[PDB]
C-alpha cells in the first residue's frame, strides 16, 4: 500500500505539470541570477558573489533533485536502483543544507558590514568570501556521510535517532537561531541609525531658527558650531564614485557653516545672518535626499525561509517519535515547500535588490 496508488491518471498528468513547471522555474530563475552577476563588473562585489554562490546550490537542486523527486512523488515507487539513490539522497540532503547555510553566510556579510563597517571591509574580499562558500559546501557534505555507513523504497537512515536530531540541528535550528540573532542585531542598528540621523537634521534645523532671530554674535556662534558638529556627523551615515557626490553636498553645507561662523567671530552678525540664509537653500535641497530597504527585504528572506523549511523539520522530528492521523501526502507536500525555497530566493532578490530589477526588465 502507497497512498498515490488511489489517485487516477487525470490528476497524475496535472501533477507531472506543476512539478515539471516548478522544477523548470527554479533552473531558469537561479540561472538568470548567476548570469546577471557573471554579466556585470559593478555587480562583481564580495556580497554579490554569495547571492550567485547561493543561486548555484539552488540550481544544483533544480536539476539533480527536483526532476527525479517527481518520478518517486507521482507514482510512489523507485525504478532506478541501489548505486543511484545513495547519491540521489546525498545531493538532496547536502544541496538543501548548502541552500540553507548560504542564507547564514549572506546574513554574516550584512551583519559584519552594518556593525563593523570600517574594519571588516578589509577582510571582505573575493578570497575570504570563497572560503565561506567552500567551508559551507564541505560542512554540507559532512552531514550526508553518517547514513552512508548504514529495493523500490528510497529513504534515509531513521534507525540511529542521534543522527536524525543532529541532521535537523546542524542544518536547521542552528541556522534559524543564528538568522534570528543576526536579523535582531541588524534591525536594531539599522533603526537606531535613522534615529541618530533624524536627531542630526533636527539639530541642524532647530539651530537655523536660533540664528534667524538672534540678537548677538555669541549665540549665532554656539548655534553655527552645533550645526557643524551635526553636519560632520550626517556625513558619516550612508565605494569612491557614487558616495563622493553624496559627501560633496555636505562639504558645501559645512563650508557655508564655516563662512557664517567667521563673520559671527568677526562680530558681523547681520553679515552672518545673510551668510546663513544660503544654508536653508542647501538644507531645502538635501531634504529630498533624506526623505531602509536592504534591511526590510531580509525580513522577507527570514519570513519565506521560516514558512518554507519549519514544517518539514518539525514534522521530521515527531514522525520517528509518534500514522498518528498522518498521511504521507503532508510529509510530501512540506518537502516541496522546502524545495520551493530554491525558487523563492531568486524572485525576492529581483523585487528587493535594485540591480536584478535593472537586469530582468531587459
Amino acid at each position, epitope marked *: 500500500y502507497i497512498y498515490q496508488d488511489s489517485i487516477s491518471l487525470p490528476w497524475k498528468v496535472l501533477l507531472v505539470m506543476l512539478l515539471a513547471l516548478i522544477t523548470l522555474a527554479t533552473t531558469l530563475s537561479n540561472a538568470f541570477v548567476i548570469a546577471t552577476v557573471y554579466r556585470t563588473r559593478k555587480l562583481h562585489t564580495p556580497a554579490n558573489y554569495l547571492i550567485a554562490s547561493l543561486a548555484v546550490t539552488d540550481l544544483l537542486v533544480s536539476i539533480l533533485v527536483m526532476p527525479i523527486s517527481t518520478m518517486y512523488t507521482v507514482t510512489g515507487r523507485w525504478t532506478l536502483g541501489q548505486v543511484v539513490c545513495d547519491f540521489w539522497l546525498s545531493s538532496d540532503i547536502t544541496c538543501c543544507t548548502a541552500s540553507i547555510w548560504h542564507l547564514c553566510v549572506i546574513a554574516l556579510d550584512r551583519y559584519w558590514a552594518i556593525t563593523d563597517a570600517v574594519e571588516y571591509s578589509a577582510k571582505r574580499t573575493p578570497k575570504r568570501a570563497a572560503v565561506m562558500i567552500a567551508l559551507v559546501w564541505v560542512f554540507s557534505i559532512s552531514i550526508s556521510l553518517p547514513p552512508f555507513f548504514w529495493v523500490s523504497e528510497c529513504v534515509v537512515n531513521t534507525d540511529h535517532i542521534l543522527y536524525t536530531v543532529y541532521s535537523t540541528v546542524g542544518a536547521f535550528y542552528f541556522p534559524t537561531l543564528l538568522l534570528i540573532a543576526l536579523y535582531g542585531r541588524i534591525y536594531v542598528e539599522a533603526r537606531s541609525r535613522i534615529a541618530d540621523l533624524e536627531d542630526n537634521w533636527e539639530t541642524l534645523n532647530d539651530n537655523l531658527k536660533v540664528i534667524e532671530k538672534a540678537d548677538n554674535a555669541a549665540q549665532v556662534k554656539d548655534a553655527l558650531t552645533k550645526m557643524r558638529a551635526a553636519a560632520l556627523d550626517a556625513q558619516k551615515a550612508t565605494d569612491s564614485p557614487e558616495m563622493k557626490d553624496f559627501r560633496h553636498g555636505f562639504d*558645501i553645507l559645512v*563650508g*557655508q557653516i*564655516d*563662512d557664517a561662523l*567667521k*563673520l559671527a567671530n568677526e562680530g*558681523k552678525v*547681520k*553679515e552672518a*545672518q*545673510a*551668510a546663513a*540664509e*544660503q544654508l*536653508k*537653500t*542647501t538644507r*531645502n*535641497a538635501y*531634504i529630498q535626499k533624506y526623505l531602509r530597504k536592504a534591511t526590510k527585504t531580509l525580513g522577507i528572506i527570514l519570513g519565506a525561509f521560516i514558512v518554507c523549511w519549519l514544517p518539514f523539520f518539525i514534522i521530521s522530528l515527531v514522525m520517528p517519535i509518534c500514522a498518528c492521523w498522518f498521511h504521507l501526502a503532508i510529509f510530501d507536500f512540506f518537502t516541496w515547500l522546502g524545495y520551493l525555497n530554491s525558487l523563492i530566493n531568486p524572485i525576492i532578490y529581483t523585487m528587493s535588490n535594485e540591480d536584478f530589477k535593472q537586469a530582468f526588465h531587459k
Partner: antibody
Amino acid sequence: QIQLQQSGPELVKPGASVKISCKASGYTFTDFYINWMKQRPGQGLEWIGWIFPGSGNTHYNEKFKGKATLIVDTSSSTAFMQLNSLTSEDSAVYFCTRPVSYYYDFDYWGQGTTLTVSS
Amino acid sequence: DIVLTQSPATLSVTPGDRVSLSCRASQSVSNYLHWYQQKSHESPRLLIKYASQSISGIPSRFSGSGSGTDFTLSINSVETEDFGMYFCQQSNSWPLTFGAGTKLELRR
C-alpha cells in the same frame, strides 16, 4: 556708492576660454556671497553658481559643472568667472550679482558682459 | 530642479488698467520668491523680494502676494513707464531658477 563693474565684451573662438571680471566697491567685498547668471536674447536667466569671496568656497548648477569656474582676487576686490571649451550655445550675457537677502534693503547687479563665440 | 511657469507669455494693458502677473512653481518654494523688471538686456531691477516685501524706491503701484506654488505680482494702476519683462526667481533650493517672463506691452 555700492557697485559691481563687469569687464567689457569679448569675441572668442569656439574651443577657447574666457575670464570675465566683477570689480566690487563700497562694501567689504569678502563679507557677501556672489552669484553669476547667464541670459541669451529671448529667454529667462539661469544661475551658474556662487563663490564666497572671504574663503573662495563655491557651489555650481550641475548644468554648468565643467563649464564655469568661479575664483576671486581679494586684494583688488574683484571676482572672475572662467568659462571653458566654448561653443555657440555660450554666446550670451553674463551678470554677477550680490543676491537678495531678507536682511538687506536691496540686491546689486553688474552691468553684464557679452561673450561672442565665433571663428 | 524647481520650474517657475510664468503666465501669461505676453500681456497688453491700457494705462489705468489693474494687472496681475502669475508665477506658478512646479513644487513649493515657501516665501523664497522674487520679482524683477527687465526693459531689455540691461540688468534686472528687483521689484519685490520674499514674495510680499517691497523694495525701497520701487513705486507703490507694485506689490507682491503668495506662498507655496501660486505667486502674483500686481500693478494696481499701470503707467506708461511700465512696459518690459517681469521675471520671478525662486531661492527655495539649488539650483536658483527663473521664469521665462511675462512681456508687458502698453496700449495707446
